[PDB]
């Protein structure tokens, strides 16, 4: 957590500069937006029955006898993250629909990316898959002052305003104390 | 040394720090330390000048001393001369100050003149070079800035001999290069 951050400005269209009583905050815009998107998708994937949307271009996949074994093992886990596989023929599946909240235009690559995660873990439970899926979903010109403000406000009210879902810094903070030291 | 490239303002915080940037990255600036450096070189130039525009005072200043101080003060009457302190002796060990350089920090013209004098009285035996410096420093130390003010400050800091360090040895500028920032955010 962190108190209200007041915008100073932005630079190179990459970083936001802000301040409050605790000192100075340098904020990576992109990282901040991953974190904010994550808090959203992590909730969405936790829903038992999400609004569903029928695709326009349905997808097909095909797997080795072994990959299909793993996929049948993880039916419930895959469906719980929004991947609705229907097997037609041998080791082949169609995807006919998905949650309405999947990131538009990247459903195809998301579904295949999630399915690939399961094939790699070989044995994975729902909680871990939900985390992984939401991380994947989260990473699917200069900002206006109103845009900087919404961003600082949204970031502040997430679970971890300091670190992106991939574990990288969102915020470099120079405290009042640290700046006093820096300069004396 | 390498001359810092032009800096562009982002903003300020707490009436204490200036935020700036250019292609090279981010600059965090102690605005007071910056103002010191600027003013220091300005006054260090003036006090090194040969003939300054002098300004008479409405009410001259009076200074009384002992047989020691009046002794020292009368020895350095060319060193306090160039430093801007003009002591006219009328009685025994007694001086009046009619005038002083027009570029003397207003309001505290007297406060300063005494400090320059004090410095002399303290070091006891002190040469031109040291006094000259000490005087410049005293004049430079003698609210939230807008981006226009911030800009003017950045340009002036650039033109100095040492934009990174104040006359007291403390850092003026903390620089994060674009590469170093990318490293910090991995
Ligand atoms: Zn990303
Ligand atoms: Zn990330
Ligand atoms: Zn000062
Ligand atoms: Zn200083």
UniProtKB/Swiss-Prot annotation, chain B:
Belongs to the DNA mismatch repair MutL/HexB family. This is DNA mismatch repair protein MutL. GO terms for cellular component: mismatch repair complex. This protein is involved in the repair of mismatches in DNA. It is required for dam-dependent methyl-directed DNA mismatch repair. May act as a 'molecular matchmaker', a protein that promotes the formation of a stable complex between two or more DNA-binding proteins in an ATP-dependent manner without itself being part of a final effector complex. Overexpression of mutSL partially suppresses the high spontaneous mutation frequency of a ytkD/mutM/mutY triple disruption which lacks the system required to prevent damage by oxidized guanine (8-oxo-dGTP). The chain holds residues 434 to 624 of 627 of the full protein. Disruption phenotype: Double mutS-mutL deletion strain have 40-60 times greater spontaneous mutation rate. Cells lacking this gene have an 80-fold increased spontaneous mutation frequency. A double mutS/mutL and a triple mutS/mutL/nth disruption have a 200 to 280-fold increased spontaneous mutation frequency. GO terms for biological process: mismatch repair. GO terms for molecular function: ATP binding; ATP hydrolysis activity; ATP-dependent DNA damage sensor activity; mismatched DNA binding. The keyword Endoplasmic reticulum does not apply. Keywords: DNA damage, DNA repair. Induction: Constitutively transcribed during vegetative growth, with a slight increase during stationary phase. Probably part of the mutS-mutL operon.
């Amino acid at each position: 957590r962190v108190p209200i951050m007041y915008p100073i400005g932005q630079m190179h269209g990459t970083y936001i500069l802000a301040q409050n009583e605790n000192g100075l905050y340098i904020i990576d815009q992109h990282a901040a937006q991953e974190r904010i998107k994550y808090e959203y998708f992590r909730e969405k994937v936790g829903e038992v029955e999400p609004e569903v949307q029928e695709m326009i271009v349905p997808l097909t996949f095909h797997y080795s006898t072994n990959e299909a074994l793993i996929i049948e093992q993880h039916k419930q886990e895959l469906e719980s993250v929004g991947v609705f596989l229907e097997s037609f023929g041998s080791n082949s599946y169609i995807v006919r629909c998905h949650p309405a909240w999947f990131p538009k235009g990247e459903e195809a690559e998301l579904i295949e990316e999630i399915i690939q995660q399961v094939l790699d873990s070989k044995n994975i439970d729902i909680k871990k898959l939900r985390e992984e899926a939401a991380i994947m979903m989260s990473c699917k010109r200069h900002l206006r002052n109103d845009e900087i403000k919404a961003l600082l406000d949204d970031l502040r009210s997430t679970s971890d305003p300091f670190t992106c879902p991939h574990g990288r810094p969102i915020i470099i903070h120079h405290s009042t104390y640290e700046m006093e030291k820096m300069f004396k």
